[PDB]
Amino acid sequence: KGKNIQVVVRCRPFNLAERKASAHSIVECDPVRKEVSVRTGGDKSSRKTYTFDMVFGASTKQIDVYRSVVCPILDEVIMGYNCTIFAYGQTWEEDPLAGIIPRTLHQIFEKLTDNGTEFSVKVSLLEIYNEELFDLLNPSSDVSERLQMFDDPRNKRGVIIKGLEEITVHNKDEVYQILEKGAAKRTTASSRSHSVFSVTIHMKETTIDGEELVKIGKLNLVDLAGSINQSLLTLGRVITALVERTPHVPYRESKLTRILQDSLGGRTRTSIIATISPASLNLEETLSTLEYAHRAKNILNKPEVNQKL
């Protein structure tokens, strides 16, 4: 019993810095066969072909790709699972995982409210920089100060980040106000930092008088920094360990993998969206992203509904 991590690969259009280098196009994205295929030299037919849960070529807008992966997750969140989406590859206009948060909360409110259901919504936003935690929704606290984290015995395989501002959200507008005044704290001059956005959703519903069903749903949106980066590196070694079935999974060897341990062979429903360059200029990074992504789809998680009757 379990669900392997859902992995989608997206290929993005050529960027202008790729045309200037005269790069040629080396990636094929076969959405119907769910295969991305890379030319490994050179005409030559040297190829390496991978299969994924979903594949998107450049013509599919980034938003549509997220949509295809997020909306189905949001229903799982509401059913009461904990879910995590890892975005790796990101960056007219081009937006990270954060840029779809207000859309996310809209659907969530819309599903809940038009269904007369009683709920609360609390959000978090932290940044992992140089192996240190930084809260991005705390307004008054000094911008250069960190957060501490220990192991909570109540959840023996999980952690607690004391000081982290959970913000309650009622209307699909507050998100914008809070979201932007969050980018205004990560401005330091961020290209090497991971951001974890978290939406927690408490839900209550009467069954028959005397009885209530209480569900809690949690979504984490992880925007992984691109490739020296302990979190990224360990993220890799965790992927590898889980798949090769080695006894010791180096979770505690980085803040990111410690924070999101349950997402990797844990009790969380996990999806990964890896974007890849079409350019021959990036064959190695592309070859890399597909290795991790390909290993990742082999990890089994065991999600459980979190609910009390």
Ligand X SMILES: NS(=O)(=O)c1ccc(-c2ccc(C(F)(F)F)c(F)c2)cc1
Q: Is there a contact between 202 and 119 (Cβ–Cβ < 8 Å)?
A: yes
Comparing CB distances to ligand X, the nearer of 185 and 192 is: 192
Q: Which x/- pattern, by CB under 6 A, does the window 233-272 give for ligand X?
A: x-xx--x--------------------------------x
C-alpha dist (Å) from residue 179 to 162, 170, 232, 256: 21, 14, 24, 21
Tokens of 68: 């295809």
Segment near ligand X (CB under 6 A); pick from 21-29, 54-62, 195-203, 229-237: 229-237
**Pairing between β-strand 307-308 and β-strand 212-223 as defined by DSSP bridges:** antiparallel
* Smallest gap from residue 290 Cβ to ligand X (A): 8
Write down the least CB distance from residue 72 to ligand X, Å: 19
Q: In the set 27, 55, 98, 232, which binds ligand X (CB under 6 A)?
A: 232
CB 206 within 8 A of CB 223: no
Binder among 52, 109, 134, 292 for ligand X (CB under 6 A): 292
Site residues for ligand X, 266-285, by CB under 6 A, read 272, 274
Torsion of the alpha carbons at 171, 216, 221 and 53, rounded to the nearest 10: -120
85 binds ligand X (CB under 6 A): no
Q: Which residue has the tokens 């490739």?
A: 227
Q: Could you tell me which of 214, 222, 211 has the C-alpha nearest to residue 260?
A: 222
- Beta-carbon contacts of 186 under 8 Å, excluding residues fewer than 6 positions away, are 127, 134, 136, 193, 195
Q: In the bound complex, what is the minimum distance in angstroms from residue 8's beta carbon to ligand X? A: 10
Site string for ligand X, 176-215 (x = CB under 6 A): ----------------------------------------
Q: Which is nearer to ligand X, 26 or 296 (CB)?
A: 296
What is the CA angle 296-257-230, rounded to 5?
100
86 lies in the binding site for ligand X (CB under 6 A): yes
Using the rule CB under 6 A, is 54 a contact of ligand X? no
List the structure tokens of 5.
């991590």
Tokens at residue 98, please?
A: 């954060």
Residues in contact with ligand X by CB under 6 A are: 86, 88, 227, 229, 232-233, 235-236, 239, 272, 274, 288-289, 292-293, 296
Binding-site entries: 89-91
Binding-site entries for ATP: 89-91
